[PDB]
Amino acid sequence: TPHYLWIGCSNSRVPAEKLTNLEPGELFVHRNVANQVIHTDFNCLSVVQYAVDVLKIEHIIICGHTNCGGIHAAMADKDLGLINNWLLHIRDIWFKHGHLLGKLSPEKRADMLTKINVAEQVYNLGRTSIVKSAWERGQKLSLHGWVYDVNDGFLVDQGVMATSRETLEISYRNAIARLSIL
Amino acid sequence: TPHYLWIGCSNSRVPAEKLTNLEPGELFVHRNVANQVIHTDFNCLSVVQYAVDVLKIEHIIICGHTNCGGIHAAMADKDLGLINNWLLHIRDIWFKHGHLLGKLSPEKRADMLTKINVAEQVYNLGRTSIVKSAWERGQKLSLHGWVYDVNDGFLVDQGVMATSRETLEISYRNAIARLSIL
Amino acid sequence: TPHYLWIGCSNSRVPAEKLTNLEPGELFVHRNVANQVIHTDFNCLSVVQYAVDVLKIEHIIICGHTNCGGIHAAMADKDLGLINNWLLHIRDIWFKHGHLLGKLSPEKRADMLTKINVAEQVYNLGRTSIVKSAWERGQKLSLHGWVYDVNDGFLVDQGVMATSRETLEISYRNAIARLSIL
Amino acid sequence: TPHYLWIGCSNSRVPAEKLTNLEPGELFVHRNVANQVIHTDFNCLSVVQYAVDVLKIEHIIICGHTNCGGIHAAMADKDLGLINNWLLHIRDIWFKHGHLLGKLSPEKRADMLTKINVAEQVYNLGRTSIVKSAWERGQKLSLHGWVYDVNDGFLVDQGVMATSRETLEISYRNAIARLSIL
Ligand SMILES: [Zn+2]
Ligand SMILES: [Zn+2]
Ligand SMILES: [Zn+2]
Ligand SMILES: [Zn+2]
Hints:
Four copies of one chain form a homotetramer.
Chain A: E1 4-9, H1 16-19, E2 27-32, H2 42-54, E3 59-65, H3 69-75, H4 82-96, H5 98-103, H6 108-127, H7 129-136, E4 142-148, E5 155-156, H8 165-179
Helix pairs in contact in A: 3-4, 6-8
The structure holds zinc ion (ZN) (4 copies).
Keywords (chains A, B, C, D): Lyase, Metal-binding, Zinc
Protein name (chains A, B, C, D): Carbonic anhydrase 2
Binding site for Zn(2+) (chains A, B, C, D): 9, 11, 65, 68
């Protein structure tokens, strides 16, 4: 069996199976643009459901990365057609935390939003009924939010790690709090 | 920078980077249950669009596989919540080719449907405005559909390969023509 | 309470509440382009779920109409951007029943596809777990497929009317059968 | 031919044709639970796109309403299957303005959130490439956001109205500014 679901970015500089030292065929993988878990996305949420319910996976890892073309385009003011719609979700976050990112130099900004994004996505994953109910029936399931420093090797980027719904709150809220005061 | 998009199954035994021999950084990856390109899926289309228009990728491979849970689930009679909605598209393909699969022996049906599905998804991909337009303005873009077997490798197929909308027809119809011979 | 869900086309020549003689605020309404019920559409399927489960509605009416801009564009070979993706579903039907429509004069065609579409959509609605489970717990729920002749007043367009899953099969299969032999 | 798009709630007490006094045939209608424009919803965007580009409509109205089940459900703690995914977007809006609503009295919260939601959805609509582009090539298009009350009529609001991306900002931020006064 696989023991982890890996939700990562479609981008190539992020190879899930290679960068970790984990055994081959242990990762059940979903990748989309800027690693998103949108409330109304049947594509991602099907993988999560197949993972949790069918494969009884005990760990979902969400994982962003620095220099993500996703995050950059999300902040660019440029019509690239259909991706612009998908990235508007990321922009909602950008402006949700706009005061933080406002302060930052216009490049720390890119990587900060990258970190914030993962937190927010773990937060979406955690409010999923797929996940929520797995918890409620006593299933062991932990969520995780990391960022792969593409020029280095990754950080358990955040204390954004839930094993229940309340631990989701503690984690996320602390995550956001911390990153809005260094 | 990337040069290929790979749309595969989320399944852990079909990792894109292991199963290809491209240079690292060259693959841009989407995975989802049973490797679908649904006409109205923002997530997958967002990736395709990002590949063709922004990254200017010139090859898309859709990789399906034998002994695939998605296909098995699509044929099974069991409720798996959201997964069911996702596989109703596959169940349509199962119905579209019911006569052919009706002939086949119950065991050989999953592997047939896996092969049909890869043809069908390439047919979807190619009918995309994203793709259609890329061709319509003369950008070079080839679609390839293959099937991987864990105990056996890629089935020497002859199978699915479009570089224009006209060849998409020729390749698609021929693939189905061939599968129908039994 | 309302007692019917009306899934109709966004188009204006089709006013649900007016054209019927039914009491005001009896119709819970969803309208989209060419009245579609796509397996993976959270928008429509949310209305259906709110209808069936929360409002305990006993009747879903799907209802197309003749001279539907949806059906026309679906058959047109013209890029209109984002709607083309949504209409590809209709095109899958067009070519599913292509031999029928092939025979017909190129305008009977428009209205035939309009009728076929409703049948197919009732069929999608009926394979929904939302609907299916309502049936399984003994809830009284009937589906219906009509077409509003925009220049006349409508026909229980088809014997496409399910009160369970097996009555869905009988109805749909007969529907398609009939319309492929006049 | 149409001249207005109406995006309203599916709710039976808020029928678009009754609540307006347009000539018959002029309204083009979308309804869904709690009148959302989600950035990655093919169904709603398909309608908008069809209105702006094909039908060349010059006004879009988003109509919300008081005592709306969608809003009530979004705030409630109950599982309603797919509906939950759909309302997580509304629950985000509830969180986005938590401080403001936190002030408010528990009863007055639904009606506040209904008002915020209409502002938010107009803000989404206006950030659409569909809309943005229409303006960007100088087509005339005005967005309007209103709230309807069954026992009272449309709340004399001053509220939400964009005819350009800059006015979308001005109108949106001002709407929120105003709602915040209490
Ligand atoms: Zn990236
Ligand atoms: Zn598989
Ligand atoms: Zn129509
Ligand atoms: Zn409502």
